Amino acid sequence: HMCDAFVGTWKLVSSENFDDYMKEVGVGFATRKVAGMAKPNMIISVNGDVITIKSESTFKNTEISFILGQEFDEVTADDRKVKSTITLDGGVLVHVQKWDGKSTTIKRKREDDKLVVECVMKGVTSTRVYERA
């Protein structure tokens, strides 16, 4: 499956504008500072129709499992309770989180040997780049 290109363990190597994205989302100062220091791993695997994405870090270990197009409840690493839907659109995993009349989108793209992750909240974008670990 086309989704195979995502499978593996990916380690954060660069981040841009993540603090301002986090402010836009509404993340509090202490969480911004501690989460911003971390170099998480993103562990993606597929079993049948179920995709699992784990985030492992000094800050928080999180895991989501989902089927594309099927909404699920997610507690985020900043402790928001959101409703999420993940789809594949033109080779990009598109993750929408909805809560309190707000929305943020996280797009995961394979580019070269990297996983490029674009996070958008209103007018504010952050890009985070992960490489195989």
Closest separation in Å from C-beta 128 to ligand K7C: 5
Segment 84-91 long-range contacts (CB within 8 Å, at least 24 positions apart):
86/51, 88/2, 88/3, 91/2
Q: Should residue 84 be labelled a site residue for ligand K7C when binding is judged by CB under 6 A?
A: no
| Between 68 and 96, CB nearer to ligand K7C | 96
CA torsion through residues 84, 19, 29, 41, sign: positive
Amino acid (one-letter) located at 12: L
Q: Should residue 128 be labelled a site residue for ligand K7C when binding is judged by CB under 6 A?
A: yes
Q: Please, are residues 49 and 38 in contact by the beta-carbon 8 Å criterion? A: no
Q: Which of 44, 93, 115, 117 binds ligand K7C (CB under 6 A)?
A: 117
Q: Should residue 76 be labelled a site residue for ligand K7C when binding is judged by CB under 6 A?
A: yes
| Between 17 and 68, CB nearer to ligand K7C | 17
Residues 2-61 that bind ligand K7C (CB under 6 A): 22, 25, 27, 35, 38, 40, 42, 55, 57, 59-60
**Who contacts 114 (Cβ-Cβ below 8 Å, separation ≥6)?**
13, 129, 130, 131
In whole angstroms, give the CA distance from residue 3 to residue 93: 9
> Is residue 21 marked as binding?
no
Q: Which residues bind ligand K7C (CB under 6 A)?
A: 22, 25, 27, 35, 38, 40, 42, 55, 57, 59-60, 76-78, 104, 106, 117, 119, 128
